[PDB]
Write a protein that binds this ligand. Structure first.
Ligand SMILES: [Ca+2]
Length: 222
């Protein structure tokens, strides 16, 4: 996260770290058994680390839970990063507590101008902001017209842009798969962009609201 601030106590309890020997992607807990992340973060098995603030320190709030299933959206396409969403089933339920709490999946799409929060442990492009301490940033949803203008022909129904076309504030490398929360619910998944925080190159996010039926029916196959 570039241009953000260290997240406050208690504040992003749905944020998870995906780990394969190291942090490589974020994700969001959406109920006791399931995490939503980005399909480009797929690995056949992952350790989900919940209750984290500093990913390098054992704080006593963490839960480490292996995946039992990792399910990419069936229409994920790497050439264009389309349908960049994935479900991870936890091999045992997460324990919900002060530090670990799910975020709801919205059935309605947030309009242009809505202020949201993105978070993660990715690059900060800052000499004093520590990427190991979870970072938070407020970003507004951009219009479709500005999103497509930034990346002509590259924006699909499954994407939205959010951030600042002036540059300086964005998600980055290592934030992928993590949450964009708007009015308390998971509107986006960190997906792609050209560079990080560059003028004219806003962040692109998977548009969670149009995947509700895939998400809920996949999770219901207990
Ligand atoms: Ca920790």
């Amino acid at each position: 996260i570039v241009g953000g601030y260290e997240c406050k106590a208690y504040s992003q309890p749905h944020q998870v770290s995906l780990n394969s020997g190291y942090h490589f992607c974020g994700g969001s807990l959406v109920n006791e058994n399931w995490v939503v992340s980005a399909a480009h973060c797929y690995k056949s098995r992952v350790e989900v680390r919940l209750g984290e603030h500093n990913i390098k320190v054992t704080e006593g709030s963490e839960q480490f839970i292996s995946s039992s299933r990792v399910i990419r959206h069936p229409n994920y396409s790497s050439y264009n990063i389309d349908n960049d969403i994935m479900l991870i089933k936890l091999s045992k339920p997460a324990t919900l507590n002060t530090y670990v709490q799910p975020v709801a999946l919205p059935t309605s799409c947030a309009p242009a101008g809505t202020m949201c929060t993105v978070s993660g442990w990715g690059n900060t492009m800052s000499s004093t902001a520590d990427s190991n301490k979870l970072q938070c940033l407020n970003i507004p949803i951009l219009s479709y017209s500005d999103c497509n203008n930034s990346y002509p022909g590259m924006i699909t129904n499954a994407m939205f842009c959010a951030g600042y076309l002036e540059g300086g504030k964005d998600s980055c490398q290592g934030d992928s798969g993590g949450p964009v929360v708007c009015n308390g619910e998971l509107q986006g998944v960190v997906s792609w962009g050209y560079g990080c925080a560059e003028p004219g190159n806003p962040g692109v996010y998977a548009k969670v609201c149009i995947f509700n039926d895939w998400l809920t029916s996949t999770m219901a196959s207990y």
